[PDB]
Amino acid sequence: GQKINPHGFRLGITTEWKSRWYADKQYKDYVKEDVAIRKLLATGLERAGIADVEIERTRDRVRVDIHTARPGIVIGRRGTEADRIRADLEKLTGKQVQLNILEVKNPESQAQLVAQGVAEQLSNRVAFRRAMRKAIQSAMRQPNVKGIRVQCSGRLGGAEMSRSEFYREGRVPLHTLRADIDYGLYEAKTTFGRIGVKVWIYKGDIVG
Amino acid sequence: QRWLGGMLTNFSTVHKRLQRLKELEAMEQTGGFEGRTKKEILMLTREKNKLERSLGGIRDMQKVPSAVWVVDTNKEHIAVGEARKLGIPVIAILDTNCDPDVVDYPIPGNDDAIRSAALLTKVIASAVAEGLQAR
RNA sequence: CGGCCAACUACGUGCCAGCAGCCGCGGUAAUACGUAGGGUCCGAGCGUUGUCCGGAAUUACUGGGCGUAAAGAGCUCGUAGGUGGUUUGUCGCGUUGUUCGUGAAAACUCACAGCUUAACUGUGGGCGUGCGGGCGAUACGGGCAGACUAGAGUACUGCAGGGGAGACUGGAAUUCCUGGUGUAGCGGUGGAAUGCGCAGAUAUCAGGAGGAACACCGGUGGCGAAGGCGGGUCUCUGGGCAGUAACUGACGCUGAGGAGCGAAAGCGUGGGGAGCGAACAGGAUUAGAUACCCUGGUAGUCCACGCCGUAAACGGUGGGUACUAGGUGUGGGUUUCCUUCCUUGGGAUCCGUGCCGUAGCUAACGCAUUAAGUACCCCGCCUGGGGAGUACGGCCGCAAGGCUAAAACUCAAAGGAAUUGACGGGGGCCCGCACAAGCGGCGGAGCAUGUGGAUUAAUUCGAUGCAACGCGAAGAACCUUAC
RNA sequence: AGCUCGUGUCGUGAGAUGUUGGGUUAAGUCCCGCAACGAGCGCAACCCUUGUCUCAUGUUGCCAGCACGUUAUGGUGGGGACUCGUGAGAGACUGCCGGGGUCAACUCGGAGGAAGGUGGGGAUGACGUCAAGUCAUCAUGCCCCUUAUGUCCAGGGCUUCACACAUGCUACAAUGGCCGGUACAAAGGGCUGCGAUGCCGUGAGGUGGAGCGAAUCCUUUCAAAGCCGGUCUCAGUUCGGAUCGGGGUCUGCAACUCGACCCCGUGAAGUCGGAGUCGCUAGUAAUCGCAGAUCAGCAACGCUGCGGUGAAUACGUUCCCG
RNA sequence: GCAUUC
């Protein structure tokens, strides 16, 4: 357990909470609902490519912002998917929700989405070295990215002995608190088990 | 001042150090000093210090030289060896202890006295001067 | 149908049943086992076993090696043999040209023909490398008859040396003996004890005896074929080097067998025996201690004359000869200059002995004019590791044993050099409550808590050197809870 | 404090160099060289907390200077002045001075300052290692069960006990025990929860419920060690408080197995612990209480944290461990 | 001084 989660390490300084509310008495109930919402969302738009979910609460208003690579599949042109999700949302939550389905500017700068892309290639029996190098090159071309690291571990290539390989390009200063490190993790599903993909994308320094 | 091993055969690498020298100097031409804490102010200023002492007469170079003139084949063995590996003609003053097979155009003479040094340096310099004028 | 080596997946057993030429595949997910589907190579054949050649430059004539991988005899001398500097003439044996005879047929090979094609068959060339006869050439090898001096040897004049042998002889020191002086310790180790003393030791002084080795000089220096050789003197005696070319005129080199020499230990007979010291005793150490350490101590170590014939007898490098950058020490001679003529002044030259470095060589390490480089002549030796330098036979020896020298069987290696790590009761340099300096605890008692063990119908499961054990449990009466 | 890469260069090659050497640092920290030239992950810094000051601001916090009350208190009118709370900012840089030094890194000392030399302490664990741990948080490949290896319930067990190990707590006392008086904290918690006064019980507690979603009220006006006084007098005791008998309280549907607490009685071992072994370098060790999470209740002497009182010693690197 | 084994 050698590496502190990059997001949590910077949570007070360089990154921000993925949910905004205040409650004293309702805190436990709010968390329970959040758990339910995020499990309902993480297992719905899997092939849509979700990076972030932000949940805002106040009175009964439940604002859910879903960041996605392409919103096309997250909203049918008839609103079909928005209506289906809002239906299950309000049902579960008990109150009224406003899905603000957004979209990500630079998909290939987004560590969670880069992790999903590597994972899906491994799910489609792509040589893991290929997927690693592809993600590295795509990310480094984009203007903010000053460095990237990608790590895949598990039964790589279907072998019986676990391997943990990593490729790195540029700077990835994990120990620097002011360094803006974007972290993503995704679990690729394969005939021989699960292989974990971690991505660290350094995008520069924040002073506040 | 000092021949950095690889100045010729590793030209693409030392060419980056040249970019960094110009970056640092140009940031100063505008004013990158007295901006931060002494600590940083000096750290940046300690780079130009060394970079110029070793690359001052190279800042102009953009490609490996077409020919190399050397004053002491033995004390400059690395420089001569790099030139011969790139097939760059070496012209050099050979004293009795130098090896005449490494050097294409050998001018016999004392490599150790400042008088004979300055003499032949200026001779080959005037040759270059006449070539530039006759260009 | 793993890689060689063309051709892959599923199911069935899971270190079993089995596969396999080699490396290797089978341990409940096998492209290697068995079956099936598919594939590949061959086809009236396809595989397997046996046998020979190839790959194997792995007995190397073409075509290999011997510093450290397997391999230079311990070192010389010399027999047979192999090999041969310069030059004149001659023979025509080797060599070479040509011609004739022969080299049966078949086969082989080229052509052409005949079976429908082919296999097969036939015809005509070539092949049949050889051998014999005649005739031609004479560069090279050889024979024969001469010449020459550069190799080899001799002579003469100098020179350095622990080269060898014999005899005599010198001093220091150890031991013992005799006698003073003088006491109670001495001796020994990491620490002790056996031991020697108190019956007069050790220590100190004087005298005597006797044996062995020769401090300083004395060195990575000299001499010797190697083994080896160091106190001095004398006697006898071997080799080397330089100078001079006086002399002989290829007389040279190497050498299977053979002969001689050959450290130390050992053996025989006779002497000697101070010190040292296998064996042998005690003491100590240790679990033991047939050892290392201590106290003693016999063969032996020494001499005379024999025997033995081995050593990491090593430069782990056979001998002779020529050639291939230099630099720098040192030993033995010659000579030219600078000149005081001081002289380690400097040069040239010949012969040794070291170090460092080119070219070239080498797997690398390294070698490098003192080759492991470039070449020629002769000898010895190697052919995977073990079994084994053993057995048997034989020769030699007083004996110990030496020399010559297998096979069965067994392994898929055994090796050389170098590299990165790790490790060391290796080194250097630094750290940490590591020790030291301190203060307070634990191991003893009672109780709480976890665990092992034992119980139990169940005492749910997990953790279980450091890094499990008041740990998962931040809460086991029911619930929790898995028993 | 190390672990590596790119491009050069050296080697037939594995590799080497860089990363060695000299100096220096807590540090592969930096300097000087240097066939190497650069770069990356580690180091350091950025973040939190503690120590000083400045500016902004006064309720629920503070009370100096003015009014009004106490039989009690900032209690109350009020006041920005001191604290304090929380926002922004300054400050430490070997920056300055003297001597060491390669006119280098860096070093020894001095001034100033709350602080001096990474000020003290958190957070932060490089490339890897141990086929370390966890299929019992969760997830998951494959295998197995599906009238059970799923699932509901009552009772029992996880609490056994001839022993052994490990981590703790309480002791063996006078630097103490007991009784009386009296002083000084920080941090934190509270809604079918924390609960004040009064009254009733020896006490655990009962009754009843003020006031607080809290800088307000409750957790006493919040501690214990401490300080003053008295008593015991070296005794297995007025030390110790295990065990066991009786009588109770509270939570809970229910305290037999198997809860905590209270009162009366009882009064065990234990006289400072063998070989051996553990922690700690200053607000540390030692010692004293307080709070929190889990939680109806608690096996809490555990764990996480908070303040009070406060030492001794470090010549030094010969020896043991890493 | 002593320090065997896996």
Ligand SMILES: [Mg+2]
């Ligand atoms: Mg194939």
Ligand SMILES: [Mg+2]
């Ligand atoms: Mg052959």
Ligand SMILES: [Mg+2]
């Ligand atoms: Mg064969």
Ligand SMILES: [Mg+2]
């Ligand atoms: Mg060979």
Ligand SMILES: [Mg+2]
């Ligand atoms: Mg040879």
Ligand SMILES: [Mg+2]
């Ligand atoms: Mg050998």
Ligand SMILES: [Mg+2]
């Ligand atoms: Mg020899």
Ligand SMILES: [Mg+2]
């Ligand atoms: Mg002869």
Ligand SMILES: [Mg+2]
């Ligand atoms: Mg001849």
Ligand SMILES: [Mg+2]
């Ligand atoms: Mg002859």
Ligand SMILES: [Mg+2]
């Ligand atoms: Mg015939």
Ligand SMILES: [Mg+2]
């Ligand atoms: Mg004699």
Ligand SMILES: [Mg+2]
């Ligand atoms: Mg006497």
Ligand SMILES: [Mg+2]
């Ligand atoms: Mg005496």
Ligand SMILES: [Mg+2]
């Ligand atoms: Mg001979």
Ligand SMILES: [Mg+2]
């Ligand atoms: Mg012979």
